[PDB]
Design a protein around this ligand. Structure first.
Ligand SMILES: [Ca+2]
Ligand SMILES: [Ca+2]
Ligand SMILES: [Ca+2]
Ligand SMILES: [Ca+2]
Lengths: 26, 148
């Protein structure tokens, strides 16, 4: 009921979206 | 034989109610730009659309419920990339990196706009700091939110 879950997950949604960019060389 | 529970739909549902500061309940470019911009960024526009297709299985410009779980469920094999969770870690820590502080998190917890403060967070860090050293380390963090 009270944890860092919904919190970490949320940021994960926006962080993953960003990481989806590229993050790769050749 | 217990997937008939509700704790699941309730967890993901909570993420949206908190993320979708609007009401639609979907991660879009306008919802992403807003929140993302609140953190301290401002990417171009064409860059966003690219961030949508690279994840919009269907193609409604915005991911809803089935699409969300599909992106977190449909796991294409495995690459052993823990960079994701890692970043989320470096994020919480705005200054030094290795432990979470009340004041530090408070600022990163106020950015949102729910109803937290110093006292409440205290109960979150205290209960999370099983050891009780004073702050939250990486262990109690990777031990409490461990992938069951
Ligand atoms: Ca929204
Ligand atoms: Ca869609
Ligand atoms: Ca830190
Ligand atoms: Ca500790």
């Amino acid at each position: 009921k009270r944890r860092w879950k919904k919190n970490f997950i949320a940021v994960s949604a926006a962080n993953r979206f960003k990481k989806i960019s590229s993050s790769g060389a050749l | 034989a217990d997937q008939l529970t509700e704790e699941q739909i309730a967890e993901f549902k909570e993420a949206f109610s908190l993320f979708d500061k609007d009401g639609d309940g979907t991660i879009t470019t306008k919802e992403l730009g807003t929140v993302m911009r609140s953190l301290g960024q401002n990417p171009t526009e064409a860059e966003l659309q690219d961030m949508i297709n690279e994840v919009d299985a269907d193609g409604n410009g915005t991911i809803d419920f089935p699409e969300f779980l599909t992106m977190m469920a449909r796991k294409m094999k495995d690459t052993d990339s823990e960079e994701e969770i890692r970043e989320a870690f470096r994020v919480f820590d705005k200054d030094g990196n290795g432990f979470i502080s009340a004041a530090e998190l408070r600022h990163v917890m106020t950015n949102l706009g729910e109803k937290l403060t110093d006292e409440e967070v205290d109960e979150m860090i205290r209960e999370a700091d099983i050891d009780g050293d004073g702050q939250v380390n990486y262990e109690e963090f990777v031990t409490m939110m461990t992938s069951k």
